[PDB]
Design an enzyme around this catalytic site. Structure first.
Site, PDB file in Angstrom:
ATOM      1  N   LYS B 108       0.847  -1.187   0.000  1.00 22.51           N
ATOM      2  CA  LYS B 108       0.000   0.000   0.000  1.00 22.51           C
ATOM      3  C   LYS B 108       0.882   1.236   0.000  1.00 22.51           C
ATOM      4  O   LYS B 108       1.929   1.252   0.643  1.00 22.51           O
ATOM      5  CB  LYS B 108      -0.946   0.031   1.208  1.00 22.51           C
ATOM      6  CG  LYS B 108      -2.123   1.003   1.066  1.00 22.51           C
ATOM      7  CD  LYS B 108      -3.137   0.519   0.034  1.00 22.51           C
ATOM      8  CE  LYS B 108      -4.380   1.399   0.003  1.00 22.51           C
ATOM      9  NZ  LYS B 108      -5.545   0.728  -0.647  1.00 22.51           N
ATOM     10  N   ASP B 148      -7.150   4.460  -5.493  1.00 20.10           N
ATOM     11  CA  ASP B 148      -7.827   4.432  -4.202  1.00 20.10           C
ATOM     12  C   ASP B 148      -8.377   5.826  -3.909  1.00 20.10           C
ATOM     13  O   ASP B 148      -8.655   6.586  -4.841  1.00 20.10           O
ATOM     14  CB  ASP B 148      -6.862   3.948  -3.108  1.00 20.10           C
ATOM     15  CG  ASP B 148      -7.578   3.372  -1.901  1.00 20.10           C
ATOM     16  OD1 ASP B 148      -8.108   2.244  -2.016  1.00 20.10           O
ATOM     17  OD2 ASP B 148      -7.614   4.044  -0.845  1.00 20.10           O
TER      18      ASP B 148
END
Lengths: 419, 419, 430, 420
Positions: B108, B148
């Site tokens: 991430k 995202d």
């Protein structure tokens, strides 16, 4: 990240409390840029102990600022190591290297790997794994690590072996340089009349910095009135001898408390040159009249209380051998009594840059002379820079901070890293 | 790092409170290894706004675990982004990807860059700088970032342009997958007798996850009784309609409060399908009798108090659309009443893996069917795994945690990353 | 193991020289190094396809043996000669490790080349081969990785072609070895006679007629010795007054044309028949055919001194032997020489110490006038001799053996100790 | 030239099979290829230093022979075995060139490994060696450059460790089934479809992967497996070995059973003996253990025992004298020999199709097709360039396979300017 934040606050407040941003407001742009590291690399270091069990550690490389040259800095293998401490250390290293006058950027790295009570094979395996995980991001033109706490000749040898397979005169530098800087401090503040000769010098810590600082204080005719460690301080009144320092070095290599070392060598520490050990106390209050103070142990080891104690004890020179040894309150005390009581404080980033300066230069006489000259130039730089931007003896704190900041910032503007 | 530590504690306690380490104690070795990320990269991102002024941000890539495949994960451009939040997100991502059954490692990344109220040129300049600083550490066989919060088609296009110059069907996935997982939950817990048909479903949040989860609840015959945002909740009794959801989506794209959106479209939210907005309150207590609960807003948005409120409201299924939506106390409540009251809790790492599963697979019907099957397989995996290692309905929390842990750990042992 | 007889001979020599000393008693960690160092860090074979002037395809093998990098980057020559294979280059690179170690320079051990035969080849064919060979080799060399130099079959022309290819892809020597060998034997004589004797008035028997032997003979002449023999693959030549410098230069010029010593004594009748006449013995080594002789310098090939010839030399009064060629003495010859060391004062020095002058000068090339370089080579060989001597004394099993110390054991142990300390520091051995 | 006896045997077999044909007469350009292709494009030796469980340093040699890439990236196994040296890996990679050529796949020839002995080594020691070896080798491999696979001594565990090291740094029935399919087509051709493996006495040597699954496929097709063997002895039966016995032998050999081997399915163990002479009348012979495991004496014994089909499961299982015997009785007694490079290419063919990647049935069907095409290729190629040209007899499958592989590799090399 409290240690880094303290260092940042010291530098920033020293620069703003000056005519720098008024004379050239462009430097206002640099503060938010340089303070964010160019790159930080955390990586898992998985290795195997002699028991065949899996060990895991964290390895870090903080490449903070490369404006003046390739990132330069040590590797520290010690359980206290994390991103915050290495950020603080690399941030300091930027301006420390700037003040050495060498083309060295700022960086610092290492691991929470604890090499104490570890076999040479376990140290070798960890070094191999760490260098395999780190070599991706270093090189002679990119990032130069060197030795520090926990990384010595053995660790460097293993690291070099791993690096080589993958790609197919230091000990006295810091203390001697610190003492040379204070030599020029005394020489300037008294128009050459006074030197280290006959100066009572209170030193804390018993590691590399403190040891060789004390040795150079002795050599120049001073009296080393104190040392310390994590458990207590030792005080003498005739001055600590070179033989006692060599003994303390040999014993600290065995990780022995000053208590236990003065116990194990009674004859050396009990004769004419006896010494008194007080456990759990810093030496600053327990040495009486003292001329020079050289904190050479850890950060925040001089409180404002202890600073006032030193000033009342007749201390007229304080210089940090350790990184950020003086608390914010201690520095406020020293600077407040500068123009009135003539007490002169010098921050670590200028005084203890001798080690990294000698590493940048990498016979004994040539190296010692070049380090001497580098520290002398550093003092002159701090002095003249403080004078040039004085709002109101000049402040060596503001001098060193503004000098390092200006060199780094001129580099960053030239290279378009700030605009 | 509290969020990561909470996720770590949930997974660890779910694994230890099982027969796993007794049946195979080798898995004991994995916990301290996998939880430390393989690599973290912080870097300064320097860019230029439309005013010609220098802006600085931090960029991160947390490559946490690559045992099952290349690091896979989103990029988040949002001022809340730091190393801790991304560590938590990548740690979750490891096992989330594990549970999708795809060969995807955990990772991430992103930046505290705030793209809100920013010109397309400023977003472009930041994307160029960030990708120039990040491209050194990604690739299709190394690390695959995706979109995202704050990284959309525009950001992805600019990032791709920078990457290309340097080297010379998603929106519904998560919510639909969560609802399919709860479909299989209900189907299993009632021997096929009950479905989402005629189930009162309380959803929190109003973002992508919550929106499409509500749409799929509607499509399957449920009644969406609530939504929420950062300022308040909205409750209805007939069920929220698809048109209301599309309106809320269009308005949240303008960053408008649910208060302001039900104000601006009175006719759509006041007729037969009127809705009541209560500011500063979570919907869990304010919906009465409810069958299914889908927290789809943020972490720690269901307290133990609210968990007991849901249980007392007749809630028999809870599944997290958001990452770690339920507090430790809420999960304790749900699990305590599992065998007695038949209340079944499913953690986020299993329910909301639909988005990353669809990204791993990257017509509408084929993609929807493959996501459906992936979520069904994920549910069966959680169920059978919980049964196989039950100390004493089986616990879907322990099921999902142990399943992801086992897949990752088998990979790590096979590759010699743990021994 | 594959049949690698020369490498195995060198390995046995070094191992037995190290074990027959107090070294493993004084520091037993060194016991670990032998099986590690003896296995090359890397060997690269590669096909080299090139094109002759007729447009026909030719194929050769190219090799790079990067043996040991503990002391520095791999350093060694490239040899273009049809006899070249993996076995010979393993032997040469293994020797090269300790040869470079004894120069006191930070040079690793390596050796490479090809079975390409440059004899009777046009400059264009040599250029095409150099291009293909260097295109196939450049992936594994560099200034910080592996430094090739010139050797048999690789000269200024070959080096130029190779460098051009390397530059497109990646975008003084002749006297060094022989002069250095003769300097080493100078220090041998000087030490063994307490300064009373030098090369002056010494009968010196040399084998071979290439660069090593040529300049060794020239230096023997310069220092006042009489060069009583030379040789080649086909026969020996013996003289009684000593071979003259003009004769050596003639043999050099003719050997550039690949001419037999019989052919060259036929072509230059006047030069080889006066006061300085010479007798050519075909198919014979000069060791037995030179009568009483003081110094022996095998400077042709490996295993060119049999045990019979070693005893013949000893009986002829030979008191100094040093290898100009790599491993010129057979195991039996070395046994003979060492047996007569303490009694007859017969002193043998292995090639890895005597012939390291060339690679030492190449290392100084990595870092001047002819005189300065000659002085620096002189110094390097003198330090090499002192190192062999003092180390053999330090680790002599025979306690305070006040006779002559073993220079074989000396050189082997000195190179071994430096390499092994390097390998331990870097974790290549543990 | 160094002493490379296995490589030299393979090279001589191929060369003499090519010269004894009309190939150099019809297209003399192929004369140029022999000295080029036989020299490996690249060989990499490297020291592999690792640490045993006692903390002592171990040293081994690792090799990668990238022999020929004309048809595609280097493809071949990794072998961890103390017998491994440059010569054996040269032999294996040389065979692998043409073995991959005959699969009809775009796969070059390569082979690698190490003299590391995994026998008495803990998983920790195997892991440490695999890490060290892959760290030393990864610089010279890649998906578009060189693809290693599993062989003797390299199994799932070793592959996992090697792949883990590679990932950190750069950031089963196929062979035997294919051999049996090849012999199926051999029988089908030699008897005009009248005979198959049904009711054939089949003598197999070895007890490893190749021999095991070859025996299982012989069972499936209705044959009788009359023997197996290993490095220490042979086992012979008269009713035929059952599948359960094969599974037991597999499980036990993975670990390096009176009731199963004493009933109707009893077996006789002869220590220190090869099975060829000890099985009586036999129809097919499948040497599937190691190289040079059929002597000329044993070949003559097989021929006298009525063996009419011989195919190598192991790499170069037949000695030169055995091959001379088989070929001499080809035209007269119908004794047909098929070299390993054609019969045992099933494993590398399936590995190449997995490179292209399927269910068990699809993979088995494509392997069947590949082996059938390989047999047809050997047959037609031997016929087209037969110097003999006597349709009163059987064509040489040895010459067929050798010439077919040679032709494909050499055409590739010509197109790319590697030969001219």
């Amino acid at each position: 990240e409290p240690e880094f934040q303290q260092a940042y606050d010291e530098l920033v407040s020293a620069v703003e409390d000056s005519t720098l941003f008024k004379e050239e407001p462009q430097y206002k742009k640099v503060i938010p840029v340089v303070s964010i590291p160019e790159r930080i690399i955390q990586f898992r270091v998985t290795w195997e102990n002699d028991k065949g069990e899996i060990e895991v550690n964290n390895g870090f490389r903080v490449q903070y600022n490369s404006a003046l040259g390739p990132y330069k800095g040590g590797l520290r293998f010690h359980p206290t190591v994390n991103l915050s401490i290495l950020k603080f250390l690399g941030f300091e290293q930027i301006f420390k290297n700037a003040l050495t006058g060498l083309s060295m950027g700022g960086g610092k790295g290492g691991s929470d790997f604890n090499p104490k009570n570890r076999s040479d094979n376990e140290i070798r395996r960890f070094c191999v794994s760490f260098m395999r995980q780190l070599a991706r991001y270093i090189g002679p033109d990119t990032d130069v690590p060197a030795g520090d706490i926990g990384v010595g000749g053995r660790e460097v040898g293993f690291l070099f072996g791993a690096y080589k397979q993958m790609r197919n005169i230091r000990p006295e530098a810091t203390g001697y340089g610190c003492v040379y800087y204070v030599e020029k401090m005394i020489e300037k503040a008294t128009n050459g009349k006074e030197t280290f000769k006959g100066k009572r010098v209170a030193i804390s810590g018993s590691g590399n910095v403190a040891q060789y600082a004390a040795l150079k204080v002795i050599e120049l005719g001073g009296t080393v009135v104190s040392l310390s460690d994590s458990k207590g301080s030792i005080i003498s009144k005739n001055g600590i001898t070179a033989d006692q320092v060599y003994a303390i070095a040999a014993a600290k290599l065995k990780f022995k408390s000053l208590e236990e070392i003065v116990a194990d060598s009674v004859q050396l520490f009990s004769g004419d040159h006896s010494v008194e050990y007080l456990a759990g106390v810093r030496p600053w209050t327990k040495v009486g009249q003292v001329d020079v103070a050289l904190p050479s142990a850890t950060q925040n080891e001089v409180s404002g209380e202890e600073a006032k104690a030193l000033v009342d004890a007749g201390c007229k020179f304080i210089a940090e051998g350790s990184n950020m040894g003086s608390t914010k309150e201690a520095i406020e005390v020293f600077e407040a009594n500068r123009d009135s009581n003539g007490v002169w404080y010098a921050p670590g980033k200028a005084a203890n840059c001798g080690g990294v300066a000698v590493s940048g230069l990498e016979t004994n006489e040539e190296v010692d002379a070049k380090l001497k000259e580098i520290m002398y130039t550093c003092f002159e730089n701090c002095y003249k820079t403080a004078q040039k931007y004085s709002i109101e003896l000049p402040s060596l704190l503001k001098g060193a901070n503004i000098a390092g900041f200006i060199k780094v910032a001129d580099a960053m503007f030239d290279q378009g890293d700030v605009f």
